[PDB]
């Protein structure tokens, strides 16, 4: 159906395509962040925000993927295929999951405008080669 | 996070357990309906509704699962494990995907109130013993 | 019953496990700090603050646990069981005790707002990658 | 440090020594009384009273000591030392726990004035030799 996860929020896969893989914390770290910061709201019966909605749905998807991984580890006889499926799930799907968790948590924290400006500036920085860009990337922080 | 995907909309996993698993249409049929009725609103850059948001996220998760299934069919050589994984994905995960797609499409089309009343009425129907269970099961309609 | 030591102050065990366990100072350091800064108020006959009340109760519980440890050392003869009990007490009970002492001392000193924001920021920091977080760890300061 | 559990409220360990140790009910009975009368206030996120603030901490200390007792029963293999530890806990630390529970539940149910007057009157009654001691001891009541 050609749907973009972030077009509804004012971003675009081509905008977050620049952030590397080493930019996103682990899935456990991002889930702990989401819990400690917005658990009372995600477990709430209210439409608190589209970010909350999408974040709930993504957490449910990841839970079902973990269920799949456990089922595989328990029900597959071939260790090669089992490990291959589990590694695919974790690495590749969690890359997208981390991307989405980061986007939504960071937006809820800072602001849509702030996050999009950070994305533009980080793209400017990461497109520039090292010989002509500063060595320290831009930084989004509450400190 | 103990999150319920229907609590922000007014239902629960216990109110939708009134409906059996063989009740929900196919993922093919539900995606056909979703396209035909809300393609231009799901592809839109707007929080048209929390239902639209959740439905976008669910469709994206299902697309990622289909990608996983194709990747499995390609890479995994063990036919037993390949078929096991594909069948688990489809049957199990698509069961929940059908529940979610049904809930959101039906709500968008008819009303949260109508869908909850339909759930309680279908519970009445399916609990009624067959000797007094009418054959004309409840059904959602606009007419 | 289901009582949380912190939800009357505006925190949570989840929000204090958001920081590492190797972050919290030793029980002796925290007791020295408590003495130095608030001895006259903890020994005072006044509800100076809920923080003072909770800190009094915690210090008394830790004193009773140390009494238990000495009683074990002098009565129990099996060195295995003796050392095992003392180690359990110290490690496990002191983790919680020093989390609580840290929370309450730091609150009395800086502010509930400051301490909660510090928890959030330090967790996000220690979870963020180095190349994209500030390089210096956060720290509370009255200076 | 030298902290008194009761001078913050208007009593002392000496004013409570008028009551014998045989006087205090079981920890089970006092926790039942608490769960009956102030459960929804001890489980609340509010500084309802210093009495609640202290009773929460005491209940948590007791829970941790019960956890220690179970951990000992499991991880120890010298029943002599195991029983020594459990008995010491339940008797020695239980006496203080039930003193504190009595004091707080009473000052919450009746009041500081009533409880202190009761302590003084019971001291009179119990210092009075038996030959001149009425049987109608002072008994806290709202009737
Ligand atoms: C195997 O299923 C048994 C019945 O499960 C019903 C449980 O009720 C909650 C299910 O709700 C959902 C629906 C969809 C989903 C997501 C969005 C994760 C989609 C999926 C199943 C395609 C991964 C998660 C939970
Ligand atoms: C393999 O990594 C590629 C990097 O990402 C490229 C762009 O991907 C777009 C991200 O889109 C999605 C799609 C689905 C999801 C959900 C929420 C369904 C979660 C997932 C990945 C666990 C299935 C998240 C982001
Ligand atoms: C063995 O009993 C001797 C009687 O001693 C009573 C006077 O000592 C002070 C009592 O005050 C208390 C009350 C409670 C406590 C805490 C809160 C630490 C609870 C406990 C006893 C469960 C560890 C500590 C001291
Ligand atoms: C190994 O410990 C794990 C860390 O657990 C952190 C969460 O702890 C939940 C209980 O919290 C507390 C905190 C303090 C306390 C007091 C103050 C009573 C002191 C103690 C730990 C000496 C009993 C009791 C329970």
Numbering used by the authors:
A (entry chain B), B (entry chain A), C (entry chain C), D (entry chain D): 1 to 143
Could you pull the original sentences from the published paper?
Next, we looked at the mutants HBc-P5T and HBc-L60V, which have a low secretion phenotype. Previous studies have shown that CLPs of both mutants are structurally almost indistinguishable from wt HBc with the exception that Phe-97 adopts both alternate rotamer conformations with similar occupancy in HBc-L60V. The maps of both mutants with added TX100 showed TX100 in the hydrophobic pockets at the same positions as in wt HBc and in HBc-F97L. Phe-97 in both mutants was in “conformation 2”. We found that TX100 binds to the hydrophobic pockets irrespective of the secretion phenotype of the HBc variant.
The envelope with the surface proteins surrounds an icosahedral capsid that is formed by 240 copies of the core protein (HBc). The building block of the capsids are dimers of HBc, which consist of an N-terminal alpha-helical assembly domain and a largely unstructured C-terminal domain (CTD). While the ARD is projecting towards the capsid interior, the NTD forms the capsid shell with protruding dimeric spikes that contact the membranous envelope. Instead, most of the mutations with a secretion phenotype map to a hydrophobic pocket in the center of the spikes below the SS-bridge in the rigid part of the assembly domain.
